[PDB]
Design an enzyme around this catalytic site. Structure first.
Site, mmCIF file in Angstrom:
data_model
loop_
_atom_site.group_PDB
_atom_site.id
_atom_site.type_symbol
_atom_site.label_atom_id
_atom_site.label_comp_id
_atom_site.label_asym_id
_atom_site.label_seq_id
_atom_site.Cartn_x
_atom_site.Cartn_y
_atom_site.Cartn_z
ATOM 1 C CB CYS A 1 43.187 32.275 34.244
ATOM 2 S SG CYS A 1 41.444 31.980 34.514
ATOM 3 N N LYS B 1 46.909 23.646 26.099
ATOM 4 C CA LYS B 1 46.054 22.923 27.042
ATOM 5 C C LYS B 1 46.031 21.432 26.724
ATOM 6 C CB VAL C 1 41.842 26.836 33.890
ATOM 7 C CG1 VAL C 1 42.460 25.610 33.265
ATOM 8 C CG2 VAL C 1 42.283 28.090 33.181
ATOM 9 C CD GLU D 1 31.492 27.503 34.907
ATOM 10 O OE1 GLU D 1 31.429 28.745 34.957
ATOM 11 O OE2 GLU D 1 31.680 26.867 33.843
ATOM 12 C CB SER D 2 36.162 30.883 39.700
ATOM 13 O OG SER D 2 35.264 31.850 39.190
#
Ligand SMILES: N[C@@H](CCC(=O)N[C@@H](CS)C(=O)NCC(=O)O)C(=O)O
Ligand SMILES: N[C@@H](CCC(=O)N[C@@H](CS)C(=O)NCC(=O)O)C(=O)O
Ligand SMILES: O=C[C@H](O)[C@@H](O)[C@H](O)[C@H](O)CO
Ligand SMILES: O=C[C@H](O)[C@@H](O)[C@H](O)[C@H](O)CO
Lengths: 197, 204
Positions: free
Chosen positions: A12, A37, A50, A62-63
Site C-alpha cells: 500500500c 482484512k 489502511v 488517512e496517511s
C-alpha cells in the site's frame, strides 16, 4: 512516550508514507501487516482502509493525518516546516497532491479504462512538477519534508503502474533517487515493495 | 496582520473564513467577490478559480480549512484547533470527514448548475440530510461539536446548517438537537458580524 501501532498494507503506497515517517523518527513502534482484512479494521476505520494508526485511546486513519500526528509527537526531524507561513504553503501542496496525483493512485490501487486515464493524468501532472528539481534538492528546497514523504511511494511505483514520463522528467527521477537513498526509506521498504523496482 | 480575504458573498466556504476572522478580532480586509461575474485574477491567485483566497504579503492561500488553520496558528485567540496533539489529530480527522461526507455535496449544490445538475443536487440534498440526521444526537449532551468549547469543527459546519432552508434540505423532528446546536452558533456575535447582507436573507 511512544505506543504506536501501524496497521499497514504491505504494498500500500499510503501505508508506505506512514512507514517512512515512523522510520525517519526512529522511535519505537510496531507494524501490523494487513491482508486485504480482519474485522477490527472496519471497526477502527469505517472506510475499511489502511494505514490506521493506534496509540492508546487514539485511532487515526488517512496517511497525512497519521503522519502529521507523528510529526507533532516526535518533532525530530521536523517534517512539517516550523514557520506558520511555510507550514501553510506545505499543507496546501499536500492537499493538492491528494487531488492531483493520489486520487489517481487510488484508482490504480482500488479498482479498467479508468486506469489508463489515471496513468495519463499522473504523467501530465509529474510533467508540470519536474522543473522544480532543476534547482531543488527536495520539494521544499534543501530540507526533506512531508512533501517528499507523500509523493515518494508514487515515484517508487511509476514502473509498477506502467507510467511513461515525458522528456522533461529527468530531474524528477534524480530527485526520486535522492529520496530512495535515505536510510529510513530503505528500512521502511517492504520485501514486496523492493521487487517493484 | 495585513490579511486580505477574497470572499464570495454567499459562498459557504468563504463564510468559514469570515467567521474565523471575526472570532479572532484581528485587523483584516474582506474583498467581496461576485461569482456571477468572477474577476480574472481569482483564477490567477487560485488555479482552481475558487474563493475563498487569503493573501498576506507574499502568501497566497486557498481552501477554506487551510486558510483557517493558518489564521488559527497566526492568531491563537481563541484557539480553534485543540492544543493537545491527540485532540488536534482527532479534530483534523473530523474536519476531513466533514469535507468528504458533507461538503463534497455542498460543492455539488454550489458549483454545478443547469437542468443537468438537478439530479446531482437531489442526491446531494439526500446525502446531507442523512448524514446530519446521524450526527444530531451528539448535540443532546454537547454544547458544541467538541463539547463545551467552540472549535474549528463548529466553524466548518455552520455555513451548511445556516443554508438548510436555502438548499431545500428538510430534517426530521429527531434532528432537533442539531438545530438547537446551530442556533447556539448563530447567536454568537462573531457569527452575526461575519454574515453578509445576502446571507442574512437566507433564513426566514
Ligand atoms: N485517503 C487514504 C487512502 C488509504 C487507502 O486507500 N488504502 C488502500 C490500500 S492502497 C486500502 O486500504 N483499501 C489515505 O491517504 O491514507
Ligand atoms: N474546498 C474549497 C471549495 C471552495 C469553493 O468551492 N468555492 C466556490 C464557491 S462556493 C467557488 O469559488 N466556485 C468558483 C466558480 O465556479 O465560479 C474550500 O474549502 O475553500
Ligand atoms: O515490523 C514491525 C516491527 O515492530 C518493527 O517496526 C520494530 O518494532 C521497529 O523497528 C521498532 O524500532
Ligand atoms: O462524540 C462526539 C465527537 O465529537 C464526534 O463524534 C464528532 O462530533 C464527529 O465530528 C461526528 O462524527
Amino acid at each position: 512516550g511512544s505506543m504506536m501501532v501501524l496497521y499497514s498494507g504491505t504494498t500500500c503506497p499510503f501505508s508506505q508514507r506512514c512507514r517512512l515517517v515512523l522510520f525517519e523518527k526512529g522511535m519505537d513502534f510496531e507494524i501490523r501487516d494487513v491482508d486485504l482484512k480482519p474485522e477490527d479494521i472496519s471497526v477502527m476505520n469505517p472506510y475499511g482502509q489502511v494505514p490506521i494508526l493506534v496509540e492508546r485511546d487514539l485511532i487515526l486513519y488517512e496517511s497525512n493525518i497519521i503522519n502529521e500526528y507523528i510529526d507533532e509527537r516526535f518533532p525530530h526531524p521536523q517534517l512539517m516546516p516550523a514557520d506558520p507561513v511555510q507550514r501553510a504553503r506545505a499543507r496546501l501542496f499536500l492537499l493538492n497532491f491528494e487531488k492531483e496525483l493520489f486520487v489517481h493512485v487510488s484508482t490504480l490501487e482500488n479498482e479498467e479504462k479508468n486506469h489508463e486515464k489515471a496513468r495519463l493524468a499522473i504523467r501530465d501532472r509529474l510533467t508540470q512538477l519536474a522543473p522544480i528539481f532543476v534547482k531543488n534538492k527536495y520539494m521544499l528546497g534543501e530540507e526533506f519534508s512531508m512533501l517528499d514523504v507523500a509523493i515518494a511511494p508514487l515515484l517508487w511505483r511509476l514502473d509498477h503502474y506502467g507510467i511513461e514520463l515525458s522528456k522533461n522528467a529527468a530531474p524528477l527521477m534524480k530527485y526520486a533517487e535522492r529520496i530512495f537513498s535515505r536510510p529510513a526509506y530503505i528500512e521502511a521498504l517492504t520485501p514486496s515493495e523492493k521487487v517493484m523496482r
